């Protein structure tokens, strides 16, 4: 375990980490001293000879210098002591052990390391001061903060090793992760908080600041965008100047509760050609979200482009907020005089409701719920009223706090804090629990010696009536302390239990990987999965997509999909395509639209068999929605003029594309039937999104637009398949292990249940049948 499976190593370095808004996503600030110690052995070659000779001349003390010279002979020259450290004349093939320099690839790691993202390749940036500086958005994968965290640095020694780092594990590559098929890095804290503030309708920027904000973008075209307001006084909006960081071609649409194309509340999101049309940018848009601006950018433009976008969004936002400022005070916890009366009187009425159930229980009139003690039933009610109360009291304050409330502002952007935090701070802390139940009678028939015996009152069993702003009574203080201690105990324990779970998952899966036959096998060549994850696709290349066909009324489906060239009402109007007039009554063509519709109906039944509930949204490769969107801007699709497509062009075009969606290659029934199988689901989606009526009426695609959409689905699909060599074993273990690490009818669940599951525990804790 300790000298072979893990060992300490040379070319390693460790120090306190600190954040930096001025580092690029993929770089790492390396202290001069650390750079002056760590070395790379470079071979003397015609290409570097002169440079290398200079670093040798520079020596071990100057920054871009060197420590040793390795002759062909094998003996090491110490530049620190060699009498010939000056007059050292290099020879091709020798090695110069030179200092670590700006842009060298290095492995950066934050322990524990329950993730492949816990060890990523960064670009060196030699800097002053004794800390490792990292870009803030890269904080999340490592799980780092700057409260006193230290991080590890490993230096590759070979051209091969360096390539491995730069080509497989570099930070930009790691953005979209296979753990949850979504981005694992997003915009955080200052930049998240500032991004909401910047993008409100209210927010307008004067020329002076616009110029600085523009210049701050390192790839800015040099083009001053036309102000949204030209006289009286030229003024730009936040939305406008943020859109300069958003690259061209980037298309995004999101509807939040109550979003119209007129977005009255500045709800949801609409980014067209990498320009914001409406809505406020926050967590859902610019965070590590599934539908994310980041998810689309990585996928559409590249990992290197997306990594640049992080830096860009932050350089603008942070600069703006530096000058706008943002604070948080006690005034932000303070709630209205009447809101406080209204809160007090909310607790007051709940306090009586509880006494009423208590008086009812003492008079033996209470009637227990089937499968519960008369007492169990009572405590349930009490606990339920008191919580209903804490929340009401909370929701009262939350509403009374204006949009100027700095806390509300942080909660609104999603930068920090939630509802409960406002509630507990402003209004009421609430009921305290230990082992699920209220504070119990540690003393004979009472919680504390300040109480009378057989006191089931909220005040006796741990209900903290007061806000943190108001302060806690000694009794409230001690009960909160009991309840508080419980969490610290599990935080403490879980830590090692969770650790060992991770180990066992890893050790059981380690030897599993995808072979060149798309088969998932172990060190015995025993097949685990015939095809990776039953679909033969890489998880990073997958996105939640809606299978339209699945739901809706049988009539609504019909309207959407049916083409009947033999009926004057259900034909494609000659406005839809050029052949419209000559297409009516074509029996031969109708045979093809019958196949089309008949397949779509087949598919509907099938999908309804797979997803029994009728759930439409599933993670599948190739975002077809986006390809269409792009075809539309790429080809400047005129939603007026008729298409130059044939029914044969659409119908057969799709039929043909399908045969080109290759996962398995072998020439034989077994492997060919296998290929058909893997591709099934994706095709149902493909056929749903590319049916004739849809393509013409909805998408309004031209032949070239369509031809392009088809080629792109193909290309994307192919890129989407898993790579033989993928160590899917470890991946899967860590993809379950890492989340288990973040874990806090009544059935045994979470960490102790996962423990039960993995152990194939014979005598389980909550056995239960669910009888339908």
């Amino acid at each position: 375990r300790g000298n072979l499976m893990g060992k300490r190593v040379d070319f390693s370095a460790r120090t306190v980490i600190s954040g930096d808004p001025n580092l690029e996503l993929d770089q790492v600030g390396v202290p001069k001293s650390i750079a002056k110690t760590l070395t790379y052995p470079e071979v003397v070659t015609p290409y570097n000879i002169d440079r290398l000779t200079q670093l040798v001349r520079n020596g071990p003390n100057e920054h871009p210098g060197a420590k040793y010279v390795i002759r062909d002979s094998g003996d090491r020259i110490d530049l620190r002591y060699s009498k010939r450290a000056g007059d050292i004349q290099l020879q091709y093939g020798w090695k110069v052990e030179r200092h670590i320099m700006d842009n060298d690839p290095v492995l950066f790691n934050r322990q524990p390391s329950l993730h492949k993202m816990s060890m990523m390749a960064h670009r060196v940036k030699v800097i002053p001061y004794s800390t490792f500086r990292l870009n803030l958005s890269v904080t999340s994968p490592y799980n780092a903060d700057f409260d006193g965290d230290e991080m590890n640095l490993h230096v590759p020694q070979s051209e091969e090793t360096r390539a491995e780092l730069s080509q497989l594990c570099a930070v930009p590559l790691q953005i979209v992760s296979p753990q949850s098929n979504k981005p694992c890095m997003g915009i955080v804290q200052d930049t998240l908080c500032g991004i909401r503030k910047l993008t409100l309708r209210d927010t307008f920027i004067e020329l002076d600041q616009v110029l600085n904000m523009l210049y701050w973008v390192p790839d800015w075209d040099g083009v001053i965008p036309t102000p949204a307001i030209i006289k009286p006084k030229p003024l730009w909006s936040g939305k406008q100047i943020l859109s300069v960081a958003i690259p061209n071609g980037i298309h995004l649409q999101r509807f939040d509760e109550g979003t119209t194309l007129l977005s009255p509340k500045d709800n949801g999101m609409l980014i067209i050609d990498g320009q914001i049309i409406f809505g406020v940018v926050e967590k859902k848009t610019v965070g590590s979200s599934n539908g994310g601006l980041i998810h689309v950018v990585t996928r559409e433009k590249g990992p290197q482009v997306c990594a640049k976008l992080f830096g860009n969004i932050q350089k603008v936002v942070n600069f703006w907020l530096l000058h706008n400022g943002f604070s948080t005070g006690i005034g932000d916890t303070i709630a209205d005089g009447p809101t406080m009366r209204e809160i007090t009187e909310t607790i007051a009425e709940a306090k009586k409701k509880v006494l009423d159930v208590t008086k009812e229980a003492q008079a033996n009139l209470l009637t227990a719920k089937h499968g519960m003690t008369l007492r169990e039933s009572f405590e349930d009610n009490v606990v339920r009223f008191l919580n209903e109360a804490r929340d009401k009291a909370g929701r009262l304050a939350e509403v009374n706090l204006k949009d100027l409330n700095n806390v509300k502002q942080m909660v609104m952007a999603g930068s920090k804090g939630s509802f409960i935090n406002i509630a507990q701070m402003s209004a009421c802390v609430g009921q305290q629990s230990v082992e699920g139940k209220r504070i119990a009678f540690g003393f004979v028939d009472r919680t504390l010696p300040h109480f009378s015996k057989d006191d089931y009152s909220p005040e006796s069993k741990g209900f903290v009536e007061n806000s943190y702003l108001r302060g806690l009574t000694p009794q409230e203080f001690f009960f909160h302390a009991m309840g508080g201690r419980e969490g610290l105990i599990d935080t403490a324990v879980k830590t090692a239990e969770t650790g060992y779970i991770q180990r066992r998952l890893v050790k059981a899966l380690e030897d599993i990987m995808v072979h060149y036959d798309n088969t998932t096998r172990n060190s015995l060549g025993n097949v685990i999965q015939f095809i990776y994850g039953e679909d033969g696709m890489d998880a990073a290349h997958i996105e939640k997509q809606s299978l339209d066909t699945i739901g809706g009324s049988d009539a609504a489906f019909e309207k959407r999909y049916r083409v009947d060239l033999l009926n004057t009402d259900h034909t494609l109007d000659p406005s839809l395509l050029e052949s419209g007039s000559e297409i009516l009554g074509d029996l031969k063509l109708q045979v093809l639209l019958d196949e089309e519709y008949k397949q779509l109906v087949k598919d509907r039944k099938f999908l309804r068999e797979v997803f029994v509930d009728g759930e439409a949204n599933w993670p599948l490769p190739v975002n077809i929605r986006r390809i269409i969107q792009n075809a539309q801007q790429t080809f400047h699709i005129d939603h007026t003029k008729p298409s130059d497509l044939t029914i044969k062009d659409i119908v057969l075009g799709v039929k043909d594309l399908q045969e080109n969606l290759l996962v398995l290659r072998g020439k034989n029934e077994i492997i060919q039937n296998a290929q058909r199988d893997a591709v099934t689901l994706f095709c149902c989606l493909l056929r749903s999104r590319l049916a004739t009526r849809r393509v013409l009426q909805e998408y309004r695609l031209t032949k070239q637009a369509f031809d392009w959409v088809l080629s792109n689905i193909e290309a994307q699909f192919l890129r989407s398949v898993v790579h033989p060599g993928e160590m899917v074993g470890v991946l899967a273990a860590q993809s379950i292990g890492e989340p288990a690490t973040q874990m806090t009818k009544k059935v045994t669940s979470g960490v102790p249940r996962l423990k039960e599951i993995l152990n194939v525990a014979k005598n389980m804790k909550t056995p239960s049948l669910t009888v339908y």
Binding site: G19, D190, L321, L322, G325, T328, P474, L488
Partner: protein, 98 residues
Amino acid sequence: TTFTHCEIHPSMILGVAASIIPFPDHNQSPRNTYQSAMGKQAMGVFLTNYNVRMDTMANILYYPQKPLGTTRAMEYLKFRELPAGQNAIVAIACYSGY
């Protein structure tokens, strides 16, 4: 009407470290548990005889300050006589993002 005893002062339920926490009745339970662990690692004058003793490691604060916000319990803890910090002018703000 049954009261046999009275509490001298409820703040006395707290130990040496928690007794330096200002308004601990206004903090979330563990934040208090954290401070009563950190203050043990806070620099200051540990004893006035520091200059006459040979100990492995000694950390002494140049200009210690008594706290502006204090506990009645600190009187007994000798804290204002031998402090662990300085009263800093603190802005809670978003600035350069550093």
